[PDB]
Amino acid sequence: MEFVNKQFNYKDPVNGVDIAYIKIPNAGQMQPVKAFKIHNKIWVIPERDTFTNPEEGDLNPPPEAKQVPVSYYDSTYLSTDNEKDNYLKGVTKLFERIYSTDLGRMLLTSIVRGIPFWGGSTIDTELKVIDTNCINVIQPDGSYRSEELNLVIIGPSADIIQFECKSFGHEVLNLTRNGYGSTQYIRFSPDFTFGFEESLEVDTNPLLGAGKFATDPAVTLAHELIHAGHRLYGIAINPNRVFKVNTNAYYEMSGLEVSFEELRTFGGHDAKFIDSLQENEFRLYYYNKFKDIASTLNKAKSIVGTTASLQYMKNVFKEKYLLSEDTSGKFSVDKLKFDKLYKMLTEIYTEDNFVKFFKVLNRKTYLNFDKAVFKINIVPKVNYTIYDGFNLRNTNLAANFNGQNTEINNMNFTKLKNFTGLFEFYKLLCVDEMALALQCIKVNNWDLFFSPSEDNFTNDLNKGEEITSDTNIEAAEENISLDLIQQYYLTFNFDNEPENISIENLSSDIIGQLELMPNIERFPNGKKYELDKYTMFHYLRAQEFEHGKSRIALTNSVNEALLNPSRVYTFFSSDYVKKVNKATEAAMFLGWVEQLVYDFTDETSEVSTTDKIADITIIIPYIGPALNIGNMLYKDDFVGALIFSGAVILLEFIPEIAIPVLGTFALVSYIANKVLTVQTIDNALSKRNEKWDEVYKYIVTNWLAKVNTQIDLIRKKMKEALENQAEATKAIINYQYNQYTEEEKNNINFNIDDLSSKLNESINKAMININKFLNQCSVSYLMNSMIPYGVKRLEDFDASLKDALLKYIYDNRGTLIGQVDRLKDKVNNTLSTDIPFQLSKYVDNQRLLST
Ligand SMILES: [Zn+2]
């Protein structure tokens, strides 16, 4: 009742104020749809989206499959009044959940504030509303009334789980990128969610649930509202600017296509893939675009198309863009204030930050792709609440995110058919049949490796700089934390919103067309690779078995588990395979099962400590035979190979890191001035600290995108490998149990859910170790294989500045008579020592900092 003020029903009578048949900007002529105004500037249309796009009227599956991990198609969805009512209540509920958090409260306020700019006038001294930023509200009497708005929530198009921000474009202006902003139409459904898998939280939660977890749809909505946020303030990054990936190697993906805008919206490490140069380019770009709005507001003389005054309208956009105004009435953009507003919309309003506030399990990267799709019902309070989500307090579902777990909370999630086939998009990995014949496995596109292009990483480190006494000292960029979010919250003006002012009627049908959007080419599909050796993907495939009818499964230690469907590979000792494959009689069964649970824990809990490697203090030897690391199929060979060559042995590809010759400093001399001569020397020295900081940050960015992503995938694959082992073990134990007759009843009394629960527990404990080990390798690599490159490049820069400052001091020794000896020592001391590399300065991730 805080954000949404009325408790709406779909069958409520049309009134023409908050419940009315409306008409939106259209290519042709549309028929009115019943819509609901949940808040000021925010409307909801409980219909399938068939009107915004003239080419999207059909709700059937497209001729071509479409390149997404998970998709769902159902034309019958959102046709019944019951469905539309439940949609309206669902969307309303999620708005309340977003608002109930400190961060969501801020976001929703910023969205209402972000009224699209009145730049539809051809005469540059008049303020006129852009017609596509409005809707026509039809009254009970028959007449219509045009109204300004910021946001519209519509149901999905053909693909039900494809959520996105849409907006209508101008013929000449780029409204979402010029600072103006345009009305946002979000395609969303609260009746479906994504199924994902996570294993990173097991450190804090050892009793974590088994299978797939469900994405809280509030997070999803908040994600789309952030996209709307950027777009309303016209600060959205060009959809052209995509993160280009290498697609030629066998281990690489066939293609991904992720926009910078997407990585920015997520936050975490994902936002840090974008380097300092490109990020500064964007910040300075929208700084000048805001200044253009300030210029147009100073040239504005009269207002047209509304009863409201020019003085009021200028004030609205003053509040929106946080402009400073003189007593003379002139507007300007404050540098420090814009940065506060930009950082907020860019770095504070992120998906990862919302997770903090909701206290829910969620994907930690964008590259943690969805695996399934579930039908949900969040409207009943017994199922979902504004405060707790799925994870209801004082219930079984409170601890370890149990409410989000598909298997424990199975009555809340019904698994649906993924319309993307398991091998719709794939590479084909082949090997010599043991080339007269080949043995080939299909690997799904999203099980492959990222591998970003070098084109995505640009810098101006080579560019020289002229040091003066007036040289600006960059304030240390404070990293995102809850303390900072708290500070923005306290400075926030929550009361007072922009008003719903009466504007003059537009034409009966608003003529509008959606934003152009770049035409993205389809990836090459089904590429074949003929390989000399078995790969990681083969070893992972060998551990898989047909879930269905076929039973008799026998575990073994050779990768010819690929040949026989009854044979499944394992990396556990030969004693484990002998024990599990042993025929057992009813009398011996329970003691045989108890002993297998024991061995399963013992094989997986194996930890070998070391001090020889450095940076890496622990090792997990069975990762070698589990994934074929370095083509050395021995537990002894993995431990030995890791000590010898370090973390690089885990990597699928060696990242290229290009640091150029660092731009030297040039000094500006001032004759007969002792004060400003000392200032320039001091300015050059503290500007060197920024240079060390700049390089360090650049290396952290490359490591975060090229290396840490690889390790991220290996841990996910180890989680899969362990799950495969438990499944195979359960299948064999359950097969033996079903081979008995009537002695199953009382004599045994065996619970498979208990066996599954105990094995899941042992997997979690194994992952605790594995996560700890693989984090060390990622950082180990950063410290010994990536940072040194920058350091010796930086030490050569210190050499150039050393002689530059010593010659400078010498050349001005008549001006600095009494201080020459002192200044000579400071230059010699500070430029001889390296600046210590602190990981906590560039990486906020506190579980990466745990090393
Ligand atoms: Zn997105």
PDB file of C-alpha atoms and ligand atoms in Angstrom, residues 163-165 223-224 227 259 261-263 265-266 351 363 366, ligand 1:
ATOM      1  CA  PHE A 163      11.947  -9.391 -20.965  1.00  0.00           C
ATOM      2  CA  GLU A 164      13.145  -6.067 -22.398  1.00  0.00           C
ATOM      3  CA  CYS A 165      12.824  -2.270 -22.403  1.00  0.00           C
ATOM      4  CA  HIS A 223      16.787  -5.383 -13.583  1.00  0.00           C
ATOM      5  CA  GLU A 224      14.405  -4.090 -16.265  1.00  0.00           C
ATOM      6  CA  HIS A 227      17.416  -0.384 -17.958  1.00  0.00           C
ATOM      7  CA  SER A 259      26.039  -5.254 -24.728  1.00  0.00           C
ATOM      8  CA  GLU A 261      24.604  -1.687 -21.244  1.00  0.00           C
ATOM      9  CA  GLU A 262      23.906  -5.212 -19.965  1.00  0.00           C
ATOM     10  CA  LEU A 263      27.238  -5.525 -18.091  1.00  0.00           C
ATOM     11  CA  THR A 265      23.180  -2.987 -15.339  1.00  0.00           C
ATOM     12  CA  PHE A 266      24.425  -6.145 -13.614  1.00  0.00           C
ATOM     13  CA  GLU A 351      21.186  -6.049 -10.215  1.00  0.00           C
ATOM     14  CA  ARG A 363      23.478 -15.539 -10.390  1.00  0.00           C
ATOM     15  CA  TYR A 366      25.822 -12.644 -16.410  1.00  0.00           C
TER      16      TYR A 366
HETATM   17 ZN    ZN B   1      19.093  -6.616 -19.331  1.00  0.00          ZN
END
